[PDB]
UniProtKB/Swiss-Prot annotation, chain A:
Functional description taken from the UniProt entry: Promotes RNA polymerase assembly. Latches the N- and C-terminal regions of the beta' subunit thereby facilitating its interaction with the beta and alpha subunits.
Subunit relationships: The RNAP catalytic core consists of 2 alpha, 1 beta, 1 beta' and 1 omega subunit. When a sigma factor is associated with the core the holoenzyme is formed, which can initiate transcription.
Keyword Transferase: yes
Reaction(s) the record says it catalyses: RNA(n) + a ribonucleoside 5'-triphosphate = RNA(n+1) + diphosphate
Originating organism: Caulobacter vibrioides (strain NA1000 / CB15N)
Protein name as it appears in the record: DNA-directed RNA polymerase subunit omega
GO cellular component, one term: DNA-directed RNA polymerase complex
Single GO term (MF): DNA binding
Protein EC: 2.7.7.6
Protein family per UniProt: Belongs to the RNA polymerase subunit omega family.
First-to-last residue of the parent protein present: 3 to 71 of 119
Domain of life, per lineage: Bacteria
Biological processes annotated in GO: DNA-templated transcription
Keywords: DNA-directed RNA polymerase, Nucleotidyltransferase, Transcription, Transferase
From Swiss-Prot, chain C:
Role this protein plays: DNA-dependent RNA polymerase catalyzes the transcription of DNA into RNA using the four ribonucleoside triphosphates as substrates.
Subunit structure of this chain's protein: The RNAP catalytic core consists of 2 alpha, 1 beta, 1 beta' and 1 omega subunit. When a sigma factor is associated with the core the holoenzyme is formed, which can initiate transcription.
Entry's family note: Belongs to the RNA polymerase beta chain family.
Residues included from the entire protein: 1067 to 1355 of 1356
UniProt-recorded name of the protein: DNA-directed RNA polymerase subunit beta
Curated annotation (Swiss-Prot), chain J:
Family designation: Belongs to the RNA polymerase beta chain family.
Record function comment: DNA-dependent RNA polymerase catalyzes the transcription of DNA into RNA using the four ribonucleoside triphosphates as substrates.
Subunit structure and binding partners: The RNAP catalytic core consists of 2 alpha, 1 beta, 1 beta' and 1 omega subunit. When a sigma factor is associated with the core the holoenzyme is formed, which can initiate transcription.
Protein's UniProt name: DNA-directed RNA polymerase subunit beta
UniProtKB/Swiss-Prot annotation, chain K:
Residues of the full protein shown: 3 to 234 of 338
Keyword line: DNA-directed RNA polymerase, Nucleotidyltransferase, Transcription, Transferase
Reactions accelerated catalytically: RNA(n) + a ribonucleoside 5'-triphosphate = RNA(n+1) + diphosphate
Subunit relationships: Homodimer. The RNAP catalytic core consists of 2 alpha, 1 beta, 1 beta' and 1 omega subunit. When a sigma factor is associated with the core the holoenzyme is formed, which can initiate transcription.
Protein name: DNA-directed RNA polymerase subunit alpha
């Protein structure tokens, strides 16, 4: 229900956005979504909508998740 | 053959380029110089013929405004960076490919250029024809066309 | 052994392939009610609405002349069947029947009433392949039938109730029902029997076939930036047998995640190459 | 024309003679197989 | 053929992230000896 | 807005043609110049959409087993008769299915009028032919009449609940067949509406227009605003303890109501009345949603409450 | 696996990112998703038991299928996948029948007519692959061809014809010379019949050329014009001045490029969606029916052909046969073929 | 995981190390009872058992142990995947 | 299931004189090959 | 399909070895091979058929009829001219003005040898027999030919022999006239063999008298039994309906009952409806067609199909299979409409995924998981030793049953299965014998 | 007989999703019969754009040629602009007869609809649409002749103007059909038309008046007692 125009404007890579939204959805699966309401939306769409009004430099947690074994 | 071409680097630092000219048959032009040079980063700063004015910087993205500005004032061929003149590491950099064709913005890092180029070359096939599909197949293979006088 | 002769009575449904007498074809679109169709004069309404843009593209014009001749003969049949409805075996009706037909038509027997029952649905017209009716012949036929000489008739709009501000062409065209049905063409599979040596889903609509992901289709995903859709669509869906059930268990449980170690086709290829003198050993 | 055209008259256009009529369309296979299997008397079957 | 992530787009970004994570792990292990 | 415009006069000129209530037309000269295409089209689109009629929906004869069989006396197959019985207009003016009998034999033309039915189904088209028998055996055909609207497939009402040997068939409930439409400006410009409705003997032409107008008015009216089950379970369905089951069997109890009604009087008056078990049983009863009393004394004491 | 095949049909009511999907195919492709929904919703117990609920096709399973198929994109591709545009994801929507609905504008990208062609459907299982196809492979994002910067959502046959019929202006028409302030007045006049569809009319329209607010200067254009121009977004360098052309297929294709170049992608897709309905509504109202009188032969051809036949007779009597046969056919018939062509034109 | 796939000539020692047993009789299966042969192409003793956790001759078909080897039969109990 | 047999069309078992139209040769010329292709037997050729 | 001339097989050029010259059309195919009926697939130009008047000589060459014409006055003795022999002759096209004794134009269009050039009336020896000589039987049915493109007409020929026979079809209003000949010539309609009158038409069998001039000591009467609904070779219904009434003396060599997709002898392929070429809200944007509900309300385009499923009862090493009436662990509701022998009764409605024939095969002992064993011990049920292998209907419309046929071995025949079937068969045989 | 009550009928036709102002509005008729959603919408659209009581202007000011003058004294725009602005003016005449109206002002300020003295007791609902910011000019003392009338009317002493005003209270309508069903039948259409009246009458009241007019004009059936 939301275009990828603002998402590409926030992050011009167009490839890191997919991984960022996937990590945001995996985090919103349990105890999250305190920034934007659901509004009858699923996890990926709500994550993409929240990315338009959220910090884009949140890949630190994604990098630290696979930092060690 | 082009499955290994992937944009890996952003900038290469290469100053070389290839001259680009418009096609002309007699007194009419087939393709405008603005449409041919559009979408590629300028190699060197182009100078306005006659008037000593720099219309385009040394290395800048040729947008539609710069495109029709160069098309308005008459100008000869301009040196433009290309993927053939790049001297980067394994792969291709985003500073020589230029503007993407699917989207208006420049090409992103990691996009496959060889596969899309092969698909675009094979798309207009099946409607061709001394030239045509066998001629293109022979030219791409670079075989012996016929007995011709050596230079 | 036992044989069951099950029979099905299929009807015309959306998605069926219906082609005309000429090269024109096309899948049948959504069927509309009788009132939504264009309301022709005298209460009649059309039954099919074809696109007229196929004439300039495909150089075929016989369908238009066929439609005009069909409209003419249908009008002739409608005008002749109404003449007999007044009084059967009328002297004036036989005169019109003999005038419209080019004479072995009149018969002394009582079978003239049976001929009118068949002619009421339109008088048949037999035109040779190379000696067909010329323009003047069809023009005179349309003029005698009572339809305007131009061939087109004014048609109203049933959906809105307004008349189009242009003449439209209407007539009777011969339509066929091709064998390419939609019920036998549709097919969907989720989990079916796998191959024997390759351990992949079988092909063909016979026993739960799977749509083959062709080599050209893999290039489309490689053109896009998609790397995870093509990675799981080739290993965890058909190739991997160990991790094939893991994704199904994760889906049925509610967690979206998958793990692919190595496809079975690569293992089969490695076992094949090892059979020859070549030594294909993995490292690291 | 006998019991077929009487029930339904079909007008024909064009001006072409109808002297010769086309043979049966299935005569090819039948004539080819008849030459193989004679099915005749003993003195016959010569080909 | 092997059934791994293609080194293009998403695969390239994931490989770059894995490389930077390995570099960070090596830097963390250098100080710990 | 309300009786202000030049409303058409009542009693429209009904052209009583020579068709016996099968082909008539209506006219209206001052009827709202400008509304000739609105009112007429609105009345025509509804006249062919919804109109309660009647038609056969189940064929069953003795000499057939399926829709692709063949009789011994008829001239055509069984499925051919299905394409002719469906085109038989009849009205029932009453709710509920019926059963029309068809038993006859003779020269072969079996007219639709020769169908012995009760005095509730007036068959139409007495000259219609169903089958043709060559002076052979008789035929026994029983029909079924209903009332729908528009169209109904053959796999929606026929195979719902029917034994083996019932020829399924679809029916079309539409009393009208074709409707015309015209508008002519009269002499003060006003349009003259002329529509010649066509219909069979099920409903008269003048009545179909009235029904369509009433349906349209009823449709347009929407816009204008004002201008405990736990007692059914047996007593031994919880398995509290062995002694509890023993005393419940000795007491001859089948329902929990008789046990919940007696709080302490009938409890202690039983042999081996468990002091610690009487509290656990009351706790497990309260946990199920029931308590002492809180209902009529032995309300569902009959077998009507059994599930 | 997790795929299906069926014939395709055209649907004008569907959006650009929505495609019709039969209930039979959707019920089989999304079986594990339906099982997970029944497990989480609480309407079922054991997994084996759930497998039994969908087998008998209970009426309650339809509500779970509509809830699960809300934003899950499915991949659709034709058989001869020549370019990368052949594979485009859509949002499935439940519909009756057995034919996969499609959009009239998206059919041009697949390069497949609706005569007998059939398309396959795939379902991404992983969450990352599902979310990756929404922002990377959606049909709304693939609006420009990868070979060159040319829009691929141009109207093919009917929308372009309707727009051309609306763009034509004729000097002789009723109700010419009146001034209309708003398009509502023009529509009310057209309903009464006082004004024709296209005729010289001066109306009020806003352009916003200085990137601010405009005083709505009056413009003289037909009612057909400025009706489709209202769908154009508010932005400089575009406006009613661009609709003055005849709205040719090349012109309408160039129009979609400038609107996408200047404004964003959402405006382009919304304008393409709005213009599609208007073209179909206008084409179905006019008499585009092709008849026998539509095609006419030039009256001068009957004399040109006889003159050419008379001229070619003298060349045969003169004759070298090769040279005569070569010069008589490339000069008499070649010039005569072009003469009748320009005559009929 | 695995990386840097290398292919080269295979020596006889490597081929002997890869193989488990040497085939000597070209007997696929028996005509009366369809079972593997002693030295045929389809051998259970060389290519593992046919059934999952069930050795031949009905001696260790309990499927509880997987490291035992049937003495009289001569094949160990292993999954059918080991036959590939 | 009834199965019909379609007729076959092949070259007539006679002598032919076919010459290539200046193809498969170093310079422009004709070969003028002749064939004695029989019905059932070894084929013969007399190519130049 | 019988007038087809293939180029592949044992001794023909392979599809990959065809090339470009074999697929091309030669100017000698005029009147011998119709260059309009050819598959538009990969093997194009290799499955061409013959013409309507083309024949085959005793040697194997293709023959074409040519009406011999003398100097001016055309003769009336048509002679078949071979392909190789017609090279040394002159051919004159048809449609020549024959109002007088000879052609008065003196410039009739004719082809001397291959290429057509305007020739004189002198030494014209051969004339075209008919214009419908270079077109095949399939393309001859196309009405108003010669007005469409050559390539588009090729597609119309392939769609001609692809239409399923509809129930209650009619002849086309605009027909080329060749439909009657192709209908009466093909083996799809019955034809009377004598002149005798008909006695009675019982629908499934028509009886005819001996003759009006029958021979002495000949057969009594000619009985013709019309085939009822039976599965064809392409899974489509095939039935014949009578057309004669009481009396109605018929001449020998006349069609009596029409075949599939035929009415009154004239050939038919489908019903025809009113058409209006116009765009309707974009529903017919691409190459599609829009139809109304009136075409489905009357049931004019409905057809019939037959699947004819089968099942075997082969024995096994671990015991013999059996057609058991009740399969283990099956629901009682699913056993409805099933005879005691295990076969569904004739005329029983069946749905997709139904048990048509209940067959159980002996299954060997197999190990089970401990949890399943614990559940079985908890519920007390005993695991069956047979496996469920009954036939089930694939996904589809699930039509009604028509007929069922069972075959038994020579050891046991009608012992305890299908005894009522054999009884009904022998009763019907005796009934028809007594009637005859 | 009871045939007009068996079919499904929407019992809650009060879905007014449009709440932007008192002019816009959007009704919903989702639970409707298949086919009625189009015919009812078309009838309502053709009736709302038809003869309905309203009020026009059909008057101009003095010292100006008909469609020929351009400016009297520092006028903002051409006379056609002022004519178009005055034509789109809401008004509801309670009494009958072609009453008169006058407008006069001064000073370099924007002209207002209210400043128009209504002697015939015909107030202006929206007195802010007219935009006249003339400075240092006596472009005042205009005369208006409001006249009652139903439906659109074509363009029909010295100083008059042939301007045709919209007597209908509504300005534009557009219906639509969208079937919304789950398991019973995917054929029940839906009517989601909207109204964009000027403000003289609310869209709900306009729809009610149209329905009442249709019910009154559909009296061509038997009384049936
Ligand atoms: Mg196609
Ligand atoms: Zn570079
Ligand atoms: Zn053992």
């Amino acid at each position: 229900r939301v275009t990828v125009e603002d998402c590409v404007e926030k992050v011009p890579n167009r490839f890191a956005l997919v991984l960022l939204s996937a990590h945001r959805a995996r985090g919103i699966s349990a105890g999250a979504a305190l920034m934007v309401d659901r509004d009858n939306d699923k996890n990926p769409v709500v994550a993409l909508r929240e990315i338009a009004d959220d910090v884009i430099d949140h890949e630190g947690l994604k990098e630290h998740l696979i930092s060690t074994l | 053959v082009a499955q290994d071409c992937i944009i890996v680097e952003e900038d290469c630092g290469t100053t070389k380029g290839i001259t680009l000219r418009a096609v002309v048959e007699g007194g009419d032009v087939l393709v405008s110089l603005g449409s041919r040079v559009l979408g590629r980063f300028t190699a060197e700063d182009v100078k306005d013929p006659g008037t000593g004015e720099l219309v385009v910087p040394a290395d800048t993205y040729i947008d539609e405004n710069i495109a029709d500005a160069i098309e308005a004032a008459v100008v000869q061929s301009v040196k433009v960076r290309s993927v053939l003149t790049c001297e980067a590491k394994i792969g291709v950099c985003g500073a020589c490919y230029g503007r993407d064709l699917a989207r208006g913005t420049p090409v992103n890092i990691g996009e496959a250029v060889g596969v899309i180029a092969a698909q675009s070359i094979g798309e207009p096939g099946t409607q061709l024809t001394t030239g045509g599909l066998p001629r293109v197949a022979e030219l791409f293979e670079a075989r012996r066309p016929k007995d011709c006088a050596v230079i | 052994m036992v044989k069951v002769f099950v029979a099905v009575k299929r009807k015309l449904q959306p998605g069926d392939k219906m082609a005309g007498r000429h090269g024109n074809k096309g899948v049948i679109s959504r069927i509309l009610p009788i009132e939504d169709m264009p309301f022709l004069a005298d209460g009649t309404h059309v039954d099919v609405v074809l696109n007229p843009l196929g004439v300039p593209s495909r150089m075929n014009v016989g369908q238009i002349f066929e439609t005009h001749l069909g409209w003419a003969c249908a009008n002739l049949g409608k005008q002749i069947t109404n003449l007999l409805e007044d009084w059967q075996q009328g002297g004036q009706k036989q005169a019109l029947v003999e005038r419209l037909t080019e004479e072995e038509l009149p018969d002394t027997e009582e079978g003239l009433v049976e001929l009118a029952r068949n002619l009421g649905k339109g008088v048949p017209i037999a035109t040779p392949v190379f000696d067909g009716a010329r323009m003047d012949d069809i023009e005179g036929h349309l003029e005698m039938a009572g339809v305007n000489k131009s061939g087109q008739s004014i048609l109203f709009d049933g959906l809105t109730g307004e008349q189009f501000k242009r003449p439209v062409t209407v007539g009777y065209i011969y339509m066929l029902k091709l064998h390419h049905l939609v019920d036998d063409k549709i097919h969907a599979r989720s989990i079916g029997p796998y191959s024997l040596v390759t351990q992949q889903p079988l092909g063909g609509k016979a026993q739960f076939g799977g749509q083959r992901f062709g080599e050209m289709e893999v290039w489309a995903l490689e053109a896009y930036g998609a790397a995870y859709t093509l990675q799981e669509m080739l290993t965890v869906k058909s190739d991997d047998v160990a991790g094939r059930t893991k994704v199904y268990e994760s889906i049925v449980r509610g967690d979206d995640t998958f793990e692919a170690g190595i496809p079975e086709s690569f293992n089969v290829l490695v076992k094949e190459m090892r059979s020859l003198g070549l030594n294909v050993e993995l490292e690291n | 024309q006998s019991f077929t055209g009487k029930k339904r008259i079909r007008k024909s256009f064009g001006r072409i003679p109808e002297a010769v009529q086309m043979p049966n369309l299935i005569e090819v296979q039948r004539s080819s197989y008849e030459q193989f299997l004679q099915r005749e008397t003993r003195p016959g079957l010569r080909r | 053929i092997v059934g791994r992530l293609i080194p293009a787009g998403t695969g390239s970004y994931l490989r770059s992230l894995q490389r930077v994570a390995a570099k960070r792990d090596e830097q963390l292990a250098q100080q710990r000896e | 807005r309300n009786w202000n415009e030049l409303i058409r006069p009542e009693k429209p000129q009904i052209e009583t043609g020579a068709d016996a209530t099968r082909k008539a037309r209506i006219v209206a000269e001052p009827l709202e110049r400008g509304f000739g295409v609105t009112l007429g089209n609105a009345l025509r689109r509804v006249l062919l959409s919804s109109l309660q009629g009647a038609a056969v929906t189940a064929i069953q004869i003795d000499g057939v087993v399926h829709e692709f069989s063949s009789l011994e006396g008829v001239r055509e197959d069984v499925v051919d008769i299905v394409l002719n019985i469906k085109q038989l207009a009849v009205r029932m003016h009453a709710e509920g299915p019926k059963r029309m009998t068809l038993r006859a034999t003779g020269p072969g033309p079996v007219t639709a009028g020769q169908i012995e039915t009760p005095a509730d189904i007036e068959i139409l088209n007495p000259d219609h032919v169903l089958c043709t028998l060559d002076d052979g055996a008789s035929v026994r055909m029983e029909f079924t009449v209903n009332n729908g609207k528009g169209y109904v497939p053959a796999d929606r009402n026929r195979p719902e609940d029917a034994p083996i040997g019932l020829i399924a068939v679809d029916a079309l409930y539409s009393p009208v067949k074709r409707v015309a439409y015209r508008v002519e400006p009269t002499r003060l410009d006003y349009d003259k509406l002329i529509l010649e409705v066509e219909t069979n003997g099920a409903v008269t032409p003048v009545d179909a227009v009235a029904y369509a107008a009433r349906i349209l008015q009823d449709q347009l009216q929407i816009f204008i605003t004002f201008e405990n089950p736990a007692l059914l379970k047996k007593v031994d369905e919880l398995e509290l303890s062995v002694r509890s089951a023993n005393c419940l069997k000795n007491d001859n109890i089948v329902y929990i109501g008789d046990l919940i009604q007696k709080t302490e009087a009938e409890m202690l008056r039983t042999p081996n009345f468990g002091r610690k078990s009487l509290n656990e049983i009351k706790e497990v009863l309260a946990g199920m949603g029931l308590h002492l009393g809180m209902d009529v004394p032995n309300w569902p004491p009959e077998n009507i409450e059994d599930l | 696996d997790y795929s299906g095949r069926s014939v395709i049909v055209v649907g004008p009511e569907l959006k650009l990112h929505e495609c019709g999907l039969p209930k039979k195919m959707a019920l089989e492709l999304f079986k594990p998703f339906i099982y997970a929904r029944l497990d989480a919703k609480g309407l079922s117990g054991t997994v084996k038991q759930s497998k039994r609920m969908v087998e008998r096709e209970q009426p309650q399973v339809w509500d779970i299928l509509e809830e699960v198929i809300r934003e899950h994109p499915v991949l659709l591709n034709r058989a001869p996948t020549l370019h990368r545009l052949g594979i485009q994801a859509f949002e499935p929507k439940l519909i009756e029948g057995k034919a996969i609905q499609l959009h009239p504008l998206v059919c041009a990208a697949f390069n497949a007519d609706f005569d007998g062609d059939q398309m396959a459907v795939h379902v991404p299982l992983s969450l990352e692959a599902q979310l990756e196809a929404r922002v990377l492979m959606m049909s709304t994002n693939n609006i420009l061809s990868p070979a060159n910067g040319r829009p691929i959502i141009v109207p093919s046959q009917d929308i372009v014809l309707g727009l051309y019929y609306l763009s034509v202006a004729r000097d002789g028409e009723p109700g010419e010379g009146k001034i209309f302030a708003d398009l509502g007045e023009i529509e009310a006049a057209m309903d009464a019949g006082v004004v024709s569809l296209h005729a010289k009319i001066k109306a009020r329209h806003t352009e916003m050329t200085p990137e601010g607010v405009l005083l709505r200067k009056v413009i003289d254009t037909t009612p057909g014009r400025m009706k489709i121009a209202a769908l154009l977004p508010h932005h400089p360098q575009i406006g009613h001045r661009l609709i003055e052309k005849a709205l040719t297929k090349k012109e309408i294709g160039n129009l979609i490029d400038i609107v996408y170049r200047h404004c964003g992608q959402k405006a382009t897709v919304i304008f393409a969606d709005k213009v599609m309905g208007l073209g179909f509504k206008e084409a179905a109202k006019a008499g585009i029916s092709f008849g026998k009188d539509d095609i006419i032969i030039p009256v001068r051809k009957t004399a040109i052909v006889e003159e050419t036949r008379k001229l070619a007779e003298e060349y045969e009597q003169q004759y070298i046969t090769k040279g005569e046969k070569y010069n008589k056919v490339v000069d008499a018939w070649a010039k005569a073929t072009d003469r009748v062509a320009d005559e009929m034109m | 995981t695995f990386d840097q796939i290398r292919i080269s000539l295979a020596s006889p020692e490597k081929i002997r190390s890869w193989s488990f047993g040497e085939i000597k009789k070209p007997e696929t299966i028996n005509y009366r009872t369809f079972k593997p042969e002693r030295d045929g192409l389809f051998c259970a003793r060389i290519f593992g058992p046919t059934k999952d956790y069930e050795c031949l001759c009905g001696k260790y078909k309990r499927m509880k142990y997987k490291g035992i080897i049937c003495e009289k039969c001569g094949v160990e109990v292993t999954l059918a995947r080991v036959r590939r | 299931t009834e199965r019909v047999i379609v007729s076959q069309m092949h070259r007539s078992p006679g002598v032919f004189f076919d010459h290539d139209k200046g193809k498969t040769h170093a310079s422009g010329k004709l070969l003028f090959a002749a064939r004695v292709i029989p019905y059932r037997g070894s084929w013969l050729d007399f190519e130049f | 399909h019988k007038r087809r001339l293939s180029a592949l097989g044992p001794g023909g050029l392979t599809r990959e070895r065809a090339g470009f010259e074999v697929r091309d059309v030669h100017p000698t195919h005029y009147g011998r091979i119709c260059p309009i009926e050819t598959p538009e697939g990969p093997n194009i130009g290799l499955i061409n058929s013959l013409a309507t008047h083309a024949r085959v000589n005793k040697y194997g060459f293709i023959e074409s009829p040519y009406r011999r014409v003398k100097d001016g006055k055309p003769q009336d003795e048509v002679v078949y001219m071979s392909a190789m022999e017609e090279s040394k002759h002159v051919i004159a096209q048809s449609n020549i003005k024959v109002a007088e004794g000879e052609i008065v134009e003196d410039l009739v269009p004719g082809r001397i040898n291959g290429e057509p050039t305007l020739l004189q009336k002198e030494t014209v020896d051969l004339m075209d027999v008919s214009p419908r000589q270079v077109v095949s039987v399939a393309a001859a049915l196309i009405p108003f030919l010669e007005n469409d493109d050559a390539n588009r007409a090729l597609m119309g020929s392939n769609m001609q022999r692809q239409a399923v026979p509809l129930v209650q079809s009619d002849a086309p209003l605009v027909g080329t006239g060749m439909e009657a000949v192709v209908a009466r010539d093909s083996g799809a309609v019955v034809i009377a063999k004598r002149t005798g009158v008909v006695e009675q038409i019982d629908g499934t069998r028509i009886v005819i008298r001996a003759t009006e001039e029958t021979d002495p000591a000949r057969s009594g009467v000619d009985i013709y039994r019309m085939s009822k609904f039976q599965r064809s070779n392409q899974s489509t219904c095939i039935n014949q309906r009578p057309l004669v009434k009481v009396g109605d003396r018929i001449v020998a060599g006349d069609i009596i009952a029409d075949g599939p997709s035929t009415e009154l002898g004239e050939l038919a392929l489908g019903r025809n409806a009113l058409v209006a070429f116009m765009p309707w809200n974009g529903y017919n944007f691409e190459d599609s067609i829009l139809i109304s509900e009136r075409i489905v309300r009357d049931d004019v385009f409905t057809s019939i199909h037959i699947e004819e499923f089968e099942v075997m009862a082969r024995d096994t090493k671990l015991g013999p299979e059996e057609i058991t009436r009740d399969i283990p662990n099956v629901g009682e509701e699913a056993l409805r409409n099933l005879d005691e022998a295990g076969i569904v009764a004739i005329g029983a409605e069946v749905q997709p995924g139904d048990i048509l024939v209940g067959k159980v095969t002996p299954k060997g002992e197999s190990p089970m998981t401990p949890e399943e064993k614990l559940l079985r011990a908890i519920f007390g049920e005993k695991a069956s030793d047979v496996r469920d292998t009954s036939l089930r209907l694939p996904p589809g419309v699930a039509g009604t049953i028509v007929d069922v046929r069972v075959f038994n071995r020579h050891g046991v025949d009608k012992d305890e299965r299908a005894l009522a079937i054999e009884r009904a068969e022998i009763d019907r045989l005796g009934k028809d014998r007594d009637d005859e």
